[PDB]
Design a binder for this molecule. Structure first.
Ligand SMILES: *[C@@H]1O[C@H](CO)[C@@H](O[C@@H]2O[C@H](CO)[C@@H](O)[C@H](O[C@@H]3O[C@H](CO)[C@@H](O)[C@H](O[C@H]4O[C@H](CO)[C@@H](O)[C@H](O)[C@@H]4O)[C@@H]3O)[C@H]2NC(C)=O)[C@H](O)[C@H]1NC(C)=O
Ligand SMILES: *[C@@H]1O[C@H](CO)[C@@H](O[C@@H]2O[C@H](CO)[C@@H](O)[C@H](O)[C@H]2NC(C)=O)[C@H](O)[C@H]1NC(C)=O
Ligand SMILES: *[C@@H]1O[C@H](CO)[C@@H](O)[C@H](O)[C@H]1NC(C)=O
Ligand SMILES: *[C@@H]1O[C@H](CO)[C@@H](O)[C@H](O)[C@H]1NC(C)=O
Lengths: 568, 563, 47
């Protein structure tokens, strides 16, 4: 069903030893077909197997095979390389210096089903022993737009390599056995259609949106799509809901029209993405917009007036290459309410950077993060000063939409901290993503949150383990709270219960708001007793204020204007 | 090179003397016809040199009741047939017939998308039955309706022997049809010859010249900049990397069966980049301060807006009667058209349809914009002008009477027009015929009213010059360059002097006169009357009485009041 | 290995390395992290 494979963005980085990086590569790419990220094959030794790479069908980024030792990388069922992310700003398929001191590295790279690369180019460098790759022509694979910047070399010296397959045209074979040659689809083909084809017949070529060949002129018999992926077909633009009608001259329901969520076309956008008027599920709307829901689902409309400021956040826009918030970029978050991006609090901001020449982050500037209210993407907090006990910098954090997720799964990750309470006093809804709280030393109040009523999207777990222990916060310094529900509490202070049973006045919860022995008299309204009209005299052992308004009292304070209790 | 096409199904022309003149003003220079290529009631000695470049017809092609010897449509390339004459017909040659059609001479016609052929009742035509219509038709309509007349009543020569197959339209050697579908090999839709190499692109429609897609003879779905394909480039690019939306700089606006840089006037643009005549529901026509308009999404209720004829509320009715006069209550912009049939002023028994009154047209006083045509064929003898439409500013003409006209006057008792504030006729033409009392017909600046090169006045059978010189039917000298509407001085469209209450006057009463008026750049307006008249000086400057150098009785710091 | 111009480029006690086969400056993370500069923690497992 084309299971989602997340991919790796850790280019040329050895994760621990060679065995640990190989186990991480086997654990990351196990039984996944479509890779939305990047296929990075680095540091694979000689005596290991790469059978888990047989199931990868397509990659939506660059394919970086670099610094390896194994003689065979079975990327056999890899069909198309999209190349959405560039390695050296124009390159997608980069095989770079796979050789040991014996100069016997990657002997063969059987990419059998690879027929087309849309974006990016091909770079081959420093391959002493490499069979049946130098005979592959790349005019069939790489399109005519990105043909100028590509360059490669081949130096076969004492490799003891055998002959290619003579039963295939132009001598281009990927391997050495039978039917192991290149299924070329471009040059032995008529120019009577701008798409691909399957043979030399003029009237038997593929659809315009069928990339990497097809098995018929119909769009259903098609291997992969080019821009949008309809259900078992390939289209350029799947139609919107309401089209024209030649009979009633009004809007008509969709015969086959759906929305547009990325590469695929789904019937309904998720509850956090913005539904535009053109029928495409988007993360962020236009630059002159106003994100506000109209009828249930989230939409964006054309803003009027000043249209002051929107925050791109970390990862997209101007701050794409910056990896954490620090003392340089925090001044752009002063008058900011909605984070349309990500927030990374990493320990690089507190230790200082000598490479990018940035000063360390002042811990008093995190109160600027008091100003923001919501996060569309994810939150990754891996750093906090040792003196402050609670994460009070995100007190007004209302909703985390989870549009962008860390490794495609997680949305809230407060890990490796020195806090004793979370203190997220306004976190009421997480629209998408997984929540992990792990690696902390002295953080209890985590198993008493009951996250199942926090998120609404089904199919989401949580990961809370090895934080404090249940027998560690048993002492008198740490308790959830009394008098409130055991649904959730964020800290030891009484303003931290999620659902207070009796009294829910403001952000705090008390014994009772006194209707008999208190000078402020607060009427109960939706289990949240708030202060009534200030010009109402408190009674003696009676109900003083009934509701919101001056017309809900018995005896007025100063003057009586009909039912109203007026000051003058 | 874009014209809108007429809508004359089978009816008689309103004026036979200006019908060929109508076809000359419209169909000249056209290559892409958005509507219908209709040739109805053309007599002999008709200069049809305006038909030698029409290639694309989006609707049907009708040749009806004509007495010409030949119709020069040799450059007719594709007939799309978005609008069909009958239910399943796209090429209808009917009742033509010394007169009658001799030869059709449809050389380049080799593609009909939707519809069939009805050649019937033409006893002068030879080669209507020897045409292989399966070569022209598309694969979807291969079971089309191919009704061909059999009786010819004239024995003529066979085809030219230079080409085989006996598939000719006429008697010339360069006239016989080249097969584009029944000569192909394999699964080729269109091809030049029998070789599989010479097959055409799948988005070519009426053949090609080479195997590429940028050199089709006619294109199947959408053309832009010489490149034609199925999907037109929209204005919204959906980036699937960070899941965002971008304005496309290379996106073109969908116009008919093509994609243009910016589609012209009287074509309302939408958010999807597909401009057309009318906008759908929950959309308001707003002005983009550039001469063109582009409707977008409206507010939340969007309840009431003025509609008219040819719309959702009025479909079957053709005239404005007392039953649909309450719906035009004080609206300044009629969505639709207005038509005053002679049956609208007639009382029909057993129907409860009361005839109109001259005092009932005063609800049309605040009208400023008509999105359709203005058709008037009956007028009472109460007032001889159109002072009930004196505030009408612009006629858009997106809906046309018979597809050709937007200001039609048929047999009235009108003597002068009186359309004072009429400043822009959008589309269509202006037909005036059989008005035996209308003198002021050539004094109107029709060239200043036009916005397209295919627009011209068609006037005939009006009051001649000899009944307008001795009778004194000539207005004042205040109307500049002869641009005059009626004999009164209040109906100059552009006079070189000032304006006193929508009336051109010679000199303002600033230095003289019993009241005092202040001078505008183009107007001349009366201010407060209690300002003191200055005997030989500039008296008044603004509407508030504080800007006088002297006033009448009392001097207060805000202004001068009588009490 | 890498000079002082790339000092502090790598995070979370990952040692800086100089790949002479491609003339590149790279990291070697400790067991548990991920990223180009060893800047992210592997959240799919413990800690
Ligand atoms: C603290 O926050 C800073 C954000 O304000 C952050 O600074 C960023 O550091 C990145 C490190 O590489 C930069 O990539 C990023 O943008 C750069 O700005 C330069 C200004 O001249 C550009 O020249 C530069 O262009 C090219 O840079 C390299 C060159 O190889 C390429 O990799 C890159 O793709 C691009 O082609 C780039 O635009 C910079 N942003 C800003 C706003 O300065 C800093 O790193 C943070 N410190 C930490 C986390 O310790
Ligand atoms: C598709 O659009 C192009 C662009 O307008 C058309 O090319 C024009 O053809 C006419 C033929 O009468 C020429 O006079 C113009 O000069 C051409 N314009 C340009 C920019 O080249 C073309 O005819 C259209 N149709 C097809 C089938 O290609
Ligand atoms: C990979 O997935 C297969 C599926 O059955 C499983 O047997 C195997 O143990 C997995 N390997 C790793 C390293 O997780
Ligand atoms: C790659 O080719 C493009 C041509 O589209 C050119 O503009 C660019 O400078 C080239 N080089 C790069 C991206 O390094």
């Amino acid at each position: 069903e084309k299971k989602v494979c997340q991919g790796t963005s850790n280019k040329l980085t050895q994760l621990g030893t060679f065995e640990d990086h190989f186990l991480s590569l086997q654990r990351m790419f196990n039984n996944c077909e479509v890779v939305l990220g990047n296929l990075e094959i680095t540091y694979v030794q000689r005596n290991y197997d790469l059978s888990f790479l047989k199931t990868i069908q397509e990659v939506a980024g660059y394919v970086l095979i670099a610094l390896n030792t194994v003689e065979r990388i079975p990327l056999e069922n890899l069909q198309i390389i999209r190349g959405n992310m560039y390695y050296e700003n124009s390159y997608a398929l980069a095989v770079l210096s796979n050789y040991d001191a014996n100069k016997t590295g990657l002997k063969e790279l059987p990419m059998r089903n690879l027929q087309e690369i849309l974006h990016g180019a091909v770079r081959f460098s420093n391959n002493p022993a490499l069979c049946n790759v130098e005979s592959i022509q790349w005019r069939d694979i790489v399109s005519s737009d990105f043909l100028s910047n590509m360059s490669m070399d081949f130096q076969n010296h004492l490799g003891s390599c055998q002959k290619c397959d003579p039963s295939c045209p132009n001598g281009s074979c990927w391997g050495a056995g039978e039917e192991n040659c290149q299924k070329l689809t471009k040059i032995i083909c008529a120019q009577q259609c701008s798409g691909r084809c399957r043979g030399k017949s003029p009237s038997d070529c593929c659809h315009n949106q069928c990339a990497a060949g097809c098995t018929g002129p119909r769009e259903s018999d098609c291997l992969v799509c080019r821009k949008f992926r309809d259900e078992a077909t390939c289209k350029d633009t799947c139609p919107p809901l309401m089209l024209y009608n030649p009979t009633t001259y009004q809007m008509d329901v969709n015969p086959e029209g759906k929305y547009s969520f990325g590469a695929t076309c789904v019937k309904k956008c998720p509850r956090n993405y913005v539904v535009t008027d053109h029928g495409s599920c988007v993360r962020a709307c236009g630059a002159d917009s106003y994100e506000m829901e109209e009828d249930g689902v989230r939409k964006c409309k054309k803003c009027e007036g000043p249209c002051r400021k929107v925050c791109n956040g970390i990862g997209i826009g101007e701050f794409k290459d910056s990896l954490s918030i620090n003392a340089t970029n925090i001044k752009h978050f002063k008058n900011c309410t909605s984070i349309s991006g990500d927030l990374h609090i990493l320990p690089v901001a507190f230790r200082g950077d000598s490479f990018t020449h940035t000063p360390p982050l002042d811990p008093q500037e995190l109160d600027i993060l008091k100003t923001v209210k919501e996060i569309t993407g994810f939150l990754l907090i891996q750093a906090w000063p040792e003196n402050r006990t609670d994460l009070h910098a995100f007190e007004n954090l209302e909703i985390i939409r989870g549009r962008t997720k860390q490794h495609g799964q997680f949305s809230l990750a407060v890990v490796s901290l020195n806090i004793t309470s979370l203190g997220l006093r306004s976190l009421k809804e997480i629209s998408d993503g997984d929540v992990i709280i792990s690696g902390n030393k002295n953080l209890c109040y985590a198993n008493t949150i009951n996250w199942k009523k926090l998120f609404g999207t089904s199919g989401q777990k949580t990961k809370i383990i090895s934080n404090r222990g249940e027998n560690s916060c048993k002492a008198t310094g740490q308790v959830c709270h009394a008098l409130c529900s055991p649904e959730g509490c964020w800290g030891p202070e009484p303003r931290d219960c999620v659902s207070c049973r009796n009294v829910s006045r403001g952000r705090e919860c008390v014994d009772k708001c006194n209707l008999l022995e208190g000078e402020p008299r607060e009427f109960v309204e939706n289990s949240e007793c708030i202060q009534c009209h200030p010009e109402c005299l408190p009674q003696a052992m009676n109900i003083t204020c009934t509701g919101r308004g001056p017309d809900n009292c018995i005896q007025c304070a100063h003057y009586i204007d009909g039912p109203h209790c007026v000051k003058t | 090179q874009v014209c809108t096409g007429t809508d004359m199904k089978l009816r008689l022309p309103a004026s036979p003397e200006t019908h060929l003149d109508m076809l000359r003003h419209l169909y000249q220079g056209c290559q892409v016809v958005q509507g219908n290529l209709e040739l109805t009631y053309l007599p002999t000695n008709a200069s049809l040199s305006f038909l030698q470049d029409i290639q694309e017809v989006q609707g049907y092609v009708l040749i009806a009741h004509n007495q010409v010897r030949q119709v020069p449509l040799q450059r007719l390339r594709i007939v799309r047939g978005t609008q069909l004459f009958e239910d399943n017909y796209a090429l209808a040659v009917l009742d033509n017939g010394p007169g009658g059609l001799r030869e059709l001479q449809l050389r380049s016609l080799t593609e009909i998308l939707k519809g069939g052929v009805l050649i019937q009742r033409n006893p002068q035509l030879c080669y209507q039955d020897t045409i292989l219509w399966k070569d022209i038709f598309h694969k979807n309509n291969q079971l089309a309706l191919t009704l061909i007349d059999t009786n010819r009543s004239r024995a003529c020569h066979p085809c030219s022997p230079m080409c085989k197959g006996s598939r000719c339209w006429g008697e010339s050697s360069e006239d016989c049809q080249s097969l584009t579908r029944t000569v192909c090999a394999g699964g080729c839709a269109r091809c030049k010859g029998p070789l599989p190499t010479d097959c055409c692109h799948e988005q070519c429609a009426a053949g090609c010249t080479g195997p590429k897609h940028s050199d089709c003879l006619a294109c199947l779905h959408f053309n832009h900049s010489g490149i034609c394909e199925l999907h037109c480039p929209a204005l919204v690019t959906y980036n699937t990397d960070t899941f965002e939306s971008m304005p496309n700089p290379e996106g073109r606006y969908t116009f008919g069966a093509s994609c243009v840089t910016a589609c012209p006037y009287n074509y309302l643009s939408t958010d999807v980049g597909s401009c057309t005549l009318v906008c759908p529901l929950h959309n308001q026509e707003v002005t983009a301060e550039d001469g063109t308009q582009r409707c977008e999404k409206c507010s939340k209720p969007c309840a009431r807006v003025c509609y008219g004829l040819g719309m959702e509320h009025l479909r079957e009715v053709r005239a404005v009667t007392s039953a649909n006069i309450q719906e035009f209550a004080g609206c300044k912009k009629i969505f639709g058209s207005l038509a005053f049939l002679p049956e609208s002023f007639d009382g029909d028994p057993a129907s409860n349809t009361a005839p109109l009154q001259p005092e009932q047209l005063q609800v049309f006083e605040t009208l400023e914009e008509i999105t359709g045509y203005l058709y008037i064929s009956a007028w009472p003898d109460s007032l001889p002008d159109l002072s009930v439409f004196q505030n009408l500013q612009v006629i858009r003409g997106r809906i046309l009477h018979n597809g050709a006209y937007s200001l039609t006057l048929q047999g009235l008792g009108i003597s002068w027009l009186g359309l004072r504030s009429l400043r822009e006729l959008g589309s269509g033409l202006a037909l005036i015929h059989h008005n035996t009392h209308l003198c002021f017909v050539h004094t109107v600046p029709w060239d200043q009213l036009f916005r397209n090169p295919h627009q011209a006045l068609l006037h005939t059978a009006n009051r001649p010059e000899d009944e307008c010189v001795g009778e004194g039917l000539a207005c004042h000298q205040l109307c500049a360059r002869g641009h005059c509407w009626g004999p009164g001085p209040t109906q100059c469209v552009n006079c070189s002097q000032f304006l006193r209450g929508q009336e051109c006057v010679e000199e303002c009463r600033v230095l003289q006169g019993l009241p005092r008026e202040y001078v505008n750049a183009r107007h001349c307006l009366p201010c407060h009357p209690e300002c003191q008249p200055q005997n030989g000086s500039v008296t008044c400057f603004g509407p508030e009485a504080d800007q006088c150098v002297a006033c009448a009785h009392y001097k207060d710091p805000p202004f001068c009041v009588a009490r | 290995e890498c000079p002082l111009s790339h000092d502090g480029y790598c995070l979370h006690d990952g040692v800086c390395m100089y790949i002479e086969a491609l003339d590149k400056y790279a990291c070697n993370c400790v067991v548990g992290y991920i990223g180009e500069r060893c800047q992210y923690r592997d959240l799919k497992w413990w800690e």
